[PDB]
Amino acid sequence: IIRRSVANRFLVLMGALFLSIWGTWTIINTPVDALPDLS
């Protein structure tokens, strides 16, 4: 599980980069609020 992932590390790095881009987008595009709806 660890050895089989370090072997093909190029795909892992590409996936990590894509995840970083997607997460940055989702973060800059997330709504905001003060407190969750307790009503």
Partner: protein, 50 residues
């Protein structure tokens, strides 16, 4: 033709749907290219051939 304050002019009908579909198709190409490149690296394991 000169406009008047308080009135607007908007084209509707097939043109609105055409513009919507055009924007969607314009922003849809990157996803296709990325999927193709990913599945190509999955098969050749090299960026060069991909």
């Amino acid at each position: 033709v000169q406009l008047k304050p308080g009135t607007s002019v908007a084209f509707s009908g097939q043109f609105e749907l055409l513009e919507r579909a055009n924007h969607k198709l314009k922003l849809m190409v990157p996803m296709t290219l990325m999927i193709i490149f990913v599945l190509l690296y999955l098969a050749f394991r090299r960026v060069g051939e991909a």
